[PDB]
Structures are given as structure tokens and as C-alpha cells.
């Protein structure tokens with residue numbers, strides 16, 4: 001356990017920042033994830049052999065899709081790292097362990113299609129899981145990999161603690177269902193502004209961790225413009241593919257997913273920042289003040305999309 005990971009000086013330094021890009025070198029991401037766990041949790045949190053073999057099974061079970069891929073998993077785990085390191089007294093030992101694993105696992109075996117498409121296709125996963133279809137599958141796959149021989153990174157926990165960490169991971173991953181985000185933030189907004197928000201109330205912590213999960217999962221919109229711009233291409237390649245598949249069921253897809261309507265994207269991103277991203281990072285900053293850079297960076301990109309619409313870029 002005297003074996004720490006060290007990154008090159010630039011990554012060692014930039015990794016602490018919310019807007020850190022994990023780069024185009026796939027083979028460095030596992031070491032980036034381990035480095036983050038060792039700093040955020042401790043070198044003793046996870047047996048290195050088991051963690052390494054858990055990370056590569058998770059990697060194996062992410063698909064070669066444009067966006068909902070292994071790079072998204074590590075990118076969302078990093079944002080969670082950045083939140084935990086900037087608020088380090090606010091979270092228990094079990095939450096620091098569970099939430100970085102929850103972020104790595106949150107989109108396991110994603111095919112690049114929405115819960116809606118599964119439903120209209122009548123996918124078997126939609127029969128098994130009536131709401132949060134993909135997100136219940138993702139948790140299912142997380143438990144599957146935890147129960148592979150030699151992959152139980154939580155072996156040293158007690159019966160109680162183990163059940164608590166798997167319950168943290170479950171709620172964490174279910175919250176990545178953006179349909180539940182809108183009601184969760186509203187409740188949080190009320191609780192905060194009436195002064196009834198209480199982080200000793202387990203049902204309140206759940207809600208806050210829920211918002212943190214939405215904030216990490218949307219964190220591509222908190223990157224420097226050139227990263228956010230190029231990530232949007234990957235996100236939209238999935239949306240257009242799903243639109244194609246909708247048209248193949250004989251359903252006209254919403255404009256967002258229609259590749260014939262690419263000209264409507266800059267307005268559609270405006271809608272998304274205002275209705276989803278800005279509110280998310282606003283309420284997050286109100287609750288967790290040190291997370292303010294995510295809101296600042298998100299606003300900067302909103303401003304850059306406004307520029308696109310005016311044909312300034």
C-alpha cells in the first residue's frame with residue numbers, strides 16, 4: 001500500500017480544477033481514476049489488485065458509442081472528485097468511496113439511446129424496468145461486476161457498511177435519470193430558501209448527492225468552450241442516430257434528434273442551459289459554495305452559444 005500513482009506536473013496540477021479534460025490517451029484514464037480515489041478517499045480505501053480489475057471490467061462493459069462511453073464515465077468521476085476535494089469535511093468515508101464508483105459505473109452498457117426510445121422500440125429492458133429504464137440497468141451491471149470473482153472492492157466493509165455503500169451507489173445512479181432531476185432540484189430550491197435544508201437529515205443528503213450526480217453528469221457544459229463545443233458533436237451524433245431509429249419505427253423524432261434540423265441546435269442548447277444546466281449548477285452553488293466555478297464556466301458557454309446564434313462564431 002506504499003504504491004501511489006503520480007501524474008505529470010501539468011495533469012497533477014490541472015486535475016484539481018473543475019474544467020480539467022482527461023485527454024485523448026485512453027490508457028492513462030485508469031491511472032487518472034486511481035490517483036483521484038487515493039487523494040479523495042485514501043490509499044487504504046481499496047485493495048489495488050481488486051480496484052484495477054474492477055476498473056478494467058467496468059471499462060470492458062462500456063460500448064464504443066460516440067458519447068455515453070468510457071471517457072464519459074471517467075470525465076463524470078473526475079467532476080465528482082473536484083466536488084469532493086473542494087468540500088472535503090461535508091461527506092462521510094462511505095460517501096467518498098461510493099460516489100466515485102457510482103460516477104464510473106453510472107452509464108454502464110449504455111447503447112446511446114434514451115429511455116424513451118427503449119420504450120417506443122419495446123426493448124426487453126423497458127418491460128423489466130418501467131421507470132429510469134437505463135439507470136436501473138446501469139446499477140444492475142454495477143452489482144454484476146462487483147460479484148465477479150476478485151472484483152469486490154468493498155470486501156473489507158462490514159455487512160451494514162456494504163449495504164449502505166450499495167444503497168448510496170443505487171440512489172446516485174438512479175438520480176442520473178434527468179426526468180427525476182427537475183423535481184429533485186425544485187425540492188432542494190424550496191428547502192434551501194425556506195432554511196429547512198439539513199445535511200444531518202438522510203433524505204436531504206440523498207437529494208443533494210442527487211443534484212451532485214446531475215452536476216457531474218452534465219459537466220461537459222462546464223469545460224472550456226473548445227472542449228464543450230467538440231463534446232456537443234459527440235452528444236448530437238447519438239441524438240441523430242436515435243432520431244434515425246425513431247423514423248425507422250415510423251415516428252417523427254423531436255427536432256433535437258432530427259439530423260435534417262441541425263440549424264436548430266444552437267437554439268436547442270440555449271434551451272438546455274437555461275432550463276437544465278444553469279438551474280442545476282445555481283442550486284448546487286447555493287448548497288455547496290466552493291462549486292461556483294462550474295456555474296461560472298457553464299454561464300461562459302451559454303454566452304458562447306448565444307454568440308453562435310448571432311453568427312459571431
Ligand SMILES: CCCc1nc(C)c2c(C#N)nc3ccc(OC)nc3n12
Pocket residue numbers: 178217218219220221228231232235256268269272
Ligand atoms: C443525456 C444527455 C444530457 C446532456 N449532457 C450534456 C453535456 C448535454 C448537452 C451538451 N453539451 N446538450 C444537451 C442538449 C439536450 C439534452 O437533452 C436531454 N441533453 C444535453 N446534454
Ligand SMILES: [Mg+2]
Pocket residue numbers: 106107134176177
Ligand atoms: Mg445516463
Ligand SMILES: [Zn+2]
Pocket residue numbers: 072076106107176217
Ligand atoms: Zn452520463
